[PDB]
């Protein structure tokens, strides 16, 4: 009856291996069915009535009037196309978004928000009490006999897609998930969650090699969504510790990796030399590896996808980086590099136009395969974990007061980690 980290010689299972013996859970909490308000809009000055389905999607946009999205052309265009797909099932006069007046619905929404804000403390407790009753059968599962919290058991409600940065699909409708969209993953001998009356699940499976309880395919881009356990669960904890244990194992292999890529700087093989500069960047600067993105995604880059436009070669072996990375967070840094790397970068860019790739002969697959030659499980993301953790360690050890003064000291050592990682909040 120990906890799993006080256990003597436990084998933690890895991704794709057998993860559980038994799994029981109650499925997913579906948001409430749409409740129409019957408020019209006005098109080119004339009142216009809507089916509940049209009205729901109109309301999604109308309600976003004060948001920056509402005034973005791509957002407005994608909304209108989505809305018209619904509207075009019947006869209607809607041809241009500019001529749609959503004001009665907006005003309805402001009345509903005021009514919600001005309920009593006792009225907002009988509401919080009724919802937590509703969620209670779904907050927990039983994984190998142990009770674990489930994280995202509430199915995503429909809405206008909120893409980060310059996402080409921002405003597009994310449609309502039905039971028929959802695959249940559960134990062979468990009680199967009952679908809502009149509906069925997509499928019920019993895959012991995965950690998810339910899955659906999202309508915006077909992205697979999963109900998984809370971070407090042992399956998350164990994979979380194993992750930090590989960063620690990298600490000991690091010197040998650097001597290896420094020899590759002098390679006449173009792939090898490019591979070397990329692993130099990932090591020293903790860049993400940068997988290729589709035409229906925002244009962002990491290491392997940097383009000529993203770096600028300055006088004293200094490289100026300027690019949007994951989440369209800007990375700006002036970096003094090895002269051998700076010269390689001149080679990698010399007669190329700004939109061309710097590492045109290197992809993340090749980089991560090479890394497996140094250490099992080693991949580019591990350097980032290694860099963040080793940066805090070093600071505590080479820069060692009141309980509050010692916290300001922590905040500052944390800030150095966050700067290296380029973590930002608006």
């Amino acid at each position: 009856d120990l906890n799993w980290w006080e256990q003597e010689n436990l084998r933690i299972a890895m991704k794709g291996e057998r993860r559980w013996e038994t799994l029981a859970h109650n499925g997913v909490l579906f948001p409430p069915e749409y409740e129409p308000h019957g408020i019209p809009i006005f098109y080119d000055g004339r009142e216009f009535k809507m089916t509940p389905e049209e009205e729901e999607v109109a309301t999604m946009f109308a309600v976003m009037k004060e948001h920056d999205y509402y005034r973005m052309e791509v957002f407005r265009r994608n909304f209108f196309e989505s809305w018209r797909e619904i509207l075009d099932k019947r006869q209607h006069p809607i041809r241009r978004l500019e001529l749609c007046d959503f004001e009665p619905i907006y005003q309805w929404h402001l009345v509903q928000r005021e009514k919600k804000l001005s309920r009593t403390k006792e009225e907002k407790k009988a509401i919080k009490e009724k919802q937590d009753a509703e969620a209670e059968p779904y907050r927990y599962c039983v994984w190998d006999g142990r009770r674990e919290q489930v994280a995202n058991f509430r199915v995503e409600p429909p809405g206008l897609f909120r893409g980060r940065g310059k996402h080409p699909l921002m405003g597009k409708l994310k449609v309502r998930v039905q039971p028929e969209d959802i695959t249940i993953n559960i134990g062979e001998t468990a009680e199967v969650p009952v679908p809502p009356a009149g509906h069925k699940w997509a499928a019920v499976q019993h895959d012991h090699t995965v950690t998810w309880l339910a899955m659906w395919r999202d309508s915006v881009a077909g992205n697979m969504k999963y109900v998984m356990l809370a971070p407090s669960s042992s399956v998350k904890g164990q994979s979380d510790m194993v992750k930090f244990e590989k960063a620690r194992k990298l600490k000991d292999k690091v010197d040998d990796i650097r001597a290896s890529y420094m020899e590759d700087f002098k390679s006449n093989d173009l792939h090898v030399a490019q591979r070397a500069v990329a692993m130099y960047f990932i090591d020293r600067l903790a860049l993400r590896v940068g997988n290729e993105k589709g035409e229906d995604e925002a244009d962002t880059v990491g290491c392997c996808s940097l383009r000529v436009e993203h770096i600028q070669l300055m006088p004293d072996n200094i490289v100026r980086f300027d690019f949007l990375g994951k989440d369209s967070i800007r990375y700006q840094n002036d970096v003094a590099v090895l002269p051998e790397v700076y010269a390689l970068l001149q080679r990698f860019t010399r007669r190329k136009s700004p939109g061309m790739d710097i590492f045109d002969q290197l992809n993340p697959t090749q980089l991560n395969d090479h890394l497996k030659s140094f250490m099992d499980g080693l991949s580019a993301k591990v350097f980032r974990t290694y860099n963040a953790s080793i940066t805090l360690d070093r600071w505590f050890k080479e820069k060692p007061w009141s309980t509050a003064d010692k916290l300001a000291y922590f905040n500052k050592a944390n800030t150095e980690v966050a700067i290296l990682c380029n973590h930002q909040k608006s």
Partner: protein, 52 residues
């Protein structure tokens, strides 16, 4: 845009590094990890003279 300290503590720093230093300098855990992030890292709480 400001520097964000949460992401690295939540995902990137070995929590045993934080827990070791907090016990060796008698700083309460509760002023670094919230209730929820403590429940994320129970395998790290016991924080012993830890060398990453």
């Amino acid at each position: 845009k400001a520097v964000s300290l949460g992401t690295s503590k939540i995902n990137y720093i070995d929590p045993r590094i934080i827990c070791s230093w907090a016990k060796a300098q008698d700083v309460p855990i509760n002023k670094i990890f919230s209730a929820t992030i403590q429940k994320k890292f129970p395998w790290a709480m016991n924080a012993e003279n830890f060398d990453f």
